[PDB]
Ligand binder design. Structure first.
Ligand SMILES: Nc1nc2c([nH]c(=O)n2[C@H]2C[C@H](O)[C@@H](COP(=O)(O)OP(=O)(O)OP(=O)(O)O)O2)c(=O)[nH]1
Ligand SMILES: [Mn+2]
Ligand code: NA
Ligand code: NA
Length: 156
């Protein structure tokens, strides 16, 4: 048994494009990703996701919808990362570069998988199909998956 820490991840997914941010420092630096971070004491997971989206991208949204949950384990780290993944298609301002992220839109036939976390190749297609999922990935360092599970679910 390991303990886990709560994180969020938000994908702004529109009919023909998705907003990603280039992580400028910290965990996952150099990879395009959705927006998110640690859940803080007192806030719901969904509200922490909304907060991180605003902090990192400048976007303010009324609602998010849950699309998946991914648990990450790293060799040498006792704590698991329990990542709650959300989407929305509905925005009403423009993204802005933050200290953490440079936002950029990608067409959905140009998803930059080689410059994303390696596990995203497995679960992001499910997100694109609007299928909910649970995943688990064990990493050695930043690049190498040693074990993983991925399943479609009816409820996140
Ligand atoms: N797509 C994808 N996202 C991941 C993976 N692993 C992982 O932690 N994430 C997400 C979850 C969070 O959105 C983010 C990690 O949180 P963070 O380090 O940005 O947290 P934060 O904003 O609170 O921290 P800080 O950088 O402000 O100090 O990366 C992965 O393998 N794939
Ligand atoms: Mn944070
Ligand atoms: Na953050
Ligand atoms: Na973050």
């Amino acid at each position: 048994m390991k303990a886990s820490r709560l994180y969020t991840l938000v994908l702004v997914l529109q009919p023909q494009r998705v907003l990603l941010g280039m992580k400028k420092r910290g965990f996952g630096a150099g990879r395009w990703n959705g927006f998110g971070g640690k859940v803080q004491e007192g806030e719901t997971i969904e509200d922490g996701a909304r907060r991180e989206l605003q902090e990192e991208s400048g976007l303010t949204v009324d609602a998010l919808h849950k699309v998946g949950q991914i648990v990450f384990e790293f060799v040498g780290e006792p704590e698991l990362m329990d990542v709650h993944v959300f989407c929305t298609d509905s925005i009403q301002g423009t993204p802005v570069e933050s200290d953490e992220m440079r936002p950029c839109w990608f067409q959905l036939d140009q998803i930059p998988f080689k410059d994303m976390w390696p596990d995203d190749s497995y679960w992001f297609p499910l997100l694109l199909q609007k299928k909910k999922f649970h995943g688990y990935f064990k990493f050695q360092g930043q690049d190498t998956i040693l074990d993983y599970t991925l399943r479609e679910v009816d409820t996140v």
